[PDB]
Write a protein that binds this ligand. Structure first.
Ligand SMILES: N=C(N)c1ccc(CNC(=O)[C@@H]2CCCN2C(=O)CNC2CCCCC2)cc1
Ligand SMILES: [Ca+2]
Length: 223
């Protein structure tokens, strides 16, 4: 997160860190046994870390649970990042509490101008690299269709939206991938891609979760 702020410990209780001996992606807890992340975050050997603030210190409140299943959308395209969504089933259910909590799926898509909360342990610099220990947050609005497509012509599918700031300075970034975009208490986006980070006229691009609510429920119900 570039241009954001320290969230505060466990203020984003649905935020998870995906770990492979290091933090490599974010995710969102949507019930005690399932996480939503980016298909481009797929790999073997995923450990889900819930309840985290400082990812480099065992502080209390952490739950480390191995992934049992990682289900990449069958129509994911690694070139266009269309359908950049993955469901991870935990080997055991998490213990839900004030610091480890699920986030609701949307009942409808969000509209342009809606303010949302984006969070993660990704890069905090727009030119170079600095990775934080504690969770970072950013308030960011959803952009209009036309503005999104003007920023990224021929690259925005119906399964993507733009959010952020055309003036630069405030954005998600590498390491935030798979993490939440939450708007009015609903999980509307997944950190997916962009051109650079926090660059002028190049806002972030997010997986449009409202298009996958039925896929998610059907897939979880059958697994
Ligand atoms: N909101 C941002 N600006 C942002 C950007 C990137 C990421 C992480 N996602 C990624 O890195 C995804 C994986 C496949 C390649 N990809 C990219 O985003 C491609 N980024 C380049 C495209 C051409 C212009 C230079 C930058 C997360 C957020
Ligand atoms: Ca910790």
């Amino acid at each position: 997160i570039v241009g954001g702020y320290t969230c505060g410990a466990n203020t984003v209780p649905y935020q998870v860190s995906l770990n492979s001996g290091y933090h490599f992606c974010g995710g969102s807890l949507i019930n005690s046994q399932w996480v939503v992340s980016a298909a481009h975050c797929y790999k073997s050997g995923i450990q889900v870390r819930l309840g985290e603030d400082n990812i480099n210190v065992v502080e209390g409140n952490e739950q480390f649970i191995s992934a049992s299943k990682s289900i990449v959308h069958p129509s994911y395209n690694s070139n266009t990042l269309n359908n950049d969504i993955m469901l991870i089933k935990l080997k055991s259910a998490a213990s839900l509490n004030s610091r480890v909590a699920s986030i609701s799926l949307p009942t409808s898509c969000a509209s342009a101008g809606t303010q949302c909360l984006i969070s993660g342990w990704g890069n905090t610099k727009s030119s170079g690299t600095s990775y934080p220990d504690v969770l970072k947050c950013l308030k960011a609005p959803i952009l209009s269709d036309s503005s999104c497509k003007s920023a990224y012509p021929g690259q925005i599918t119906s399964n993507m939206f733009c959010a952020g700031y055309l003036e630069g300075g405030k954005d998600s970034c590498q390491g935030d991938s798979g993490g939440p975009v939450v708007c009015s208490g609903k999980l509307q986006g997944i950190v997916s891609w962009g051109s650079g980070c926090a660059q002028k006229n190049k806002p972030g691009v997010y997986t449009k979760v409202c298009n996958y609510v039925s896929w998610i429920k059907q897939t979880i119900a059958s697994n």
